[PDB]
């Protein structure tokens, strides 16, 4: 029935820091939530590095070309 129901084991998949059912969470959760958002953040860093350079190319294309500066001061 709905009580004979049982949950299998994910110990083949879980993190090592939680496999001991006798322990408790809240001692690694703060870390487990940190390592993954670190990937989210570190990802977000490099995308921003891409944006500053890739856009400035286009914007600096809108800028005065090299041909004009030759005629500017002289």
């Amino acid at each position: 029935s709905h009580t004979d129901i049982k949950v299998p084991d994910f110990s083949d998949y879980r993190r090592p820091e939680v496999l001991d059912s006798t322990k408790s969470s809240k001692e690694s959760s703060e870390a487990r939530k940190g390592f993954s958002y670190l990937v989210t953040a570190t990802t977000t860093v490099g995308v921003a590095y891409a944006a500053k350079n890739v856009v400035s190319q286009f914007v600096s294309s809108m800028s005065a070309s090299a041909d004009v500066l030759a005629m500017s001061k002289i």
Binding site: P8, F10, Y13, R14, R15, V18, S29, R32, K33
Partner: protein, 74 residues
Amino acid sequence: RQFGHLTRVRHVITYSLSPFEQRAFPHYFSKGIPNVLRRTRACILRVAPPFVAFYLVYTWGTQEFEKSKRKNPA
């Protein structure tokens, strides 16, 4: 269309876990690599032999073309 009025389901159970409670890449090398090969052994025989002939027709296509520009004894 959206969720709610698609179809019928009866007597089905779904178990699943947070991502945080499991490593992202467990058994990648350990279990993935055979599954790669198993995926390979089911497809190579119906994919390669065209490309096998292609490599040959790409070969003989040059050699005969290579000889034709080379002269004849006359």
